[PDB]
């Protein structure tokens with residue numbers, strides 16, 4: 171079967187594991203346990219296509235930055251995640267984009283920009299600036315909430331659709 | 337506010353009204369009452385953007401074919417719908433594509449190909465041939481079921497994302 175190797179990349183604390191655990195185990199994780207690298211495989215049917223989602227949950231911590239070049243080489247699509255209440259994570263999203271581009275030696279890499287934690291009333295990054303950023307990148311912009319499960323299948327499935335049209 | 341004029345086009349019986357009524361009124365319609373043309377306006381928040389979805393539900397019946405040129409001129413994005421248990425509706429989807437292209441005088445029009453009724457066990461159109469068709473068109477392919485509400489917000493929201501990046 172078709173396997174899709176989807177990498178979740180993003181600063182420390184933005185909710186990566188929390189988007190992968192909602193999708194994989196339908197539970198929101200309230201705790202914070204920092205990831206080094208975690209792999210999840212799930213057979214799913216997306217748009218009638220039976221397939222296997224191989225998902226890598228990576229680290230936000232700059233200690234682990236070294237390993238970035240190894241998983242960007244093997245990933246076919248990247249969820250680039252920032253938290254709507256954290257402007258630095260939003261700015262950091264460019265440090266991943268550039269790095270992914272550079273180890274994959276291409277400008278068009280399948281990617282989705284994900285503004286997570288959209289359940290938070292106290293937002294510092296507005297939709298508008300993240301849409302203009304996704305518009306500049308040429309990728310879809312999806313708001314998500316790992317806690318309400320809002321926008322979660324949507325993000326990962328739109329990523330699958332970006333890899334399919336590439 | 338941002339308004340998006342989304343046109344639902346597709347052969348007779350494929351489930352257009354049924355996708356618009358699930359989205360608009362969260363009810364599946366079991367009855368068949370043939371549309372001539374229906375407009376639905378709803379203020380929605382998509383990816384944190386408050387906006388208004390202006391939706392036109394059109395006719396499948398070739399009697400009404402004349403009116404096609406008027407609404408294709410004003411629509412900004414088109415849901416092109418076929419039923420998975422009806423190969424002729426799938427073939428018909430090219431007669432709409434070509435017509436839309438031609439009154440809008442452009443090849444890239446925001447559009448999503450939607451294979452509806454995916455709840456049906458007795459499928460005649462396989463994912464694979466509809467994905468290769470969406471892949472040839474350069475548009476996303478979404479399977480939906482107006483009866484289970486599967487893939488319905490996804491289709492209309494991916495259409496909104498196609499209009500936004502255009």
Ligand SMILES: Nc1nc2c(ncn2[C@@H]2O[C@H](COP(=O)(O)OP(=O)(O)NP(=O)(O)O)[C@@H](O)[C@H]2O)c(=O)[nH]1
Pocket residue numbers: 180181182183184185186187188189199200201202203204205206228229230231286287288289290314315316317318
């Ligand atoms: N309110 C809210 N909290 C969230 C959301 N997603 C994640 N969180 C919270 O954010 C904290 C960190 O989440 P986590 O998923 O570990 O983020 P991470 O990006 O994987 N951290 P790391 O880089 O170290 O691996 C946790 O307390 C978690 O519950 C969300 O949508 N909303």
Ligand SMILES: Nc1nc2c(ncn2[C@@H]2O[C@H](COP(=O)(O)OP(=O)(O)NP(=O)(O)O)[C@@H](O)[C@H]2O)c(=O)[nH]1
Pocket residue numbers: 346347348349350351352353354355365366367368369370371372394395396397452453454455456480481482483484
């Ligand atoms: N099982 C199933 N039936 C569906 C689905 N969507 C619509 N239908 C059924 O298909 C029939 C026609 O649906 P309708 O929504 O009127 O299609 P239409 O494309 O709008 N017809 P028209 O071109 O004349 O306006 C109805 O009996 C309806 O309940 C679906 O996902 N699954």
Ligand SMILES: [Mg+2]
Pocket residue numbers: 186187204205227228229230
């Ligand atoms: Mg993590």
Ligand SMILES: [Mg+2]
Pocket residue numbers: 352353370371393394395396
């Ligand atoms: Mg109709």
